[PDB]
Amino acid sequence: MGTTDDVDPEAEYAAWKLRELRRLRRERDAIEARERELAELERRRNLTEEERRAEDEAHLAKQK
């Protein structure tokens, strides 16, 4: 086929606005995911020796 730009400038800009919003939402989702990762990291960091042992043992026996 072929493409013609600016046949409906307003509509095309609106569509682009939605695409860019989609990218923005994607970025936000990524950020929140990263913060969840940091949260879990911190959570592991604050486990006691025995708590971490119990957790890791539980996970291992579960994967078994």
């Binding site: 086929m1 072929g2 695409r19 860019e20 919003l21 990218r23």
Partner: protein, 215 residues
């Protein structure tokens, strides 16, 4: 009397021994897969329209011949003129001035020239530079055709750029693996991307205001 064929043959048959590297440290001859290189150099478009061409000729060829973005398509495995010209750019190894012209000035006039330049940049440039150069054209909303199984489907320049920035394979070509943008941000090489629209919160405020007032 054909030095062109000799030069092409030299480039195709072996490189890196006598080849200057791309700014990302890759060898231009091996950036695209051997199979695809074969499909291209054997192609009619390469033989009749890419033979002995120049950097000026590149713009002329883009305006004249490329009507879509794509890699290799169909049972016959035909490479698009776009792909062939990309390979030719890999051959010519153009400098920053020429790329600057294509991208900004040519790109402003000819969208497929911008698509080609962006593709080539993604192929040959360091990751930070690629993000910085290509991300502004997420604001370029011009329509582009992409080659599908039959005919073509609609896509957009910002979508093509986003594809270059977020995908491993584009136009039947594997793009050299990059550090993810968040990695660069973590390393303080890059600040977070700033959208033309602004932050998501700002967009929410404008949306709420538009809704509250009569419209």
């Amino acid at each position: 009397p054909d030095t062109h064929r000799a030069d092409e043959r030299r480039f195709l048959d072996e490189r890196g021994s006598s080849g200057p590297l791309a700014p990302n440290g890759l060898n231009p001859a091996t950036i695209m897969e051997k199979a695809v290189r074969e499909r291209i150099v054997e192609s009619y478009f390469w033989k009749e329209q890419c033979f002995g061409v120049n950097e000026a000729d590149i713009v002329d060829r883009v305006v004249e011949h490329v009507r879509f973005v794509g890699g290799v398509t169909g049972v016959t495995q035909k490479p698009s003129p776009f792909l062939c010209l990309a390979f030719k750019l890999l051959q010519l190894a153009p400098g920053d001035d020429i790329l600057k012209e294509y991208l900004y000035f040519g790109g402003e006039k000819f969208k497929y020239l911008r698509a080609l330049a962006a593709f080539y940049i993604r192929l040959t440039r360091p990751d930070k530079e690629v993000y910085t150069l290509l991300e502004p054209f997420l604001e370029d909303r011009r329509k582009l055709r992409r080659k599908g199984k039959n005919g073509t489907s609609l896509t957009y320049m910002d979508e093509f750029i986003d594809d270059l920035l977020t995908k491993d394979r584009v136009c039947s070509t594997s793009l050299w693996k990059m550090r993810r943008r968040d990695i660069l941000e973590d390393l303080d090489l890059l600040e977070p991307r700033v959208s033309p629209l602004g932050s998501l919160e700002d967009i929410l405020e404008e949306e709420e205001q538009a809704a509250k007032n009569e419209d």
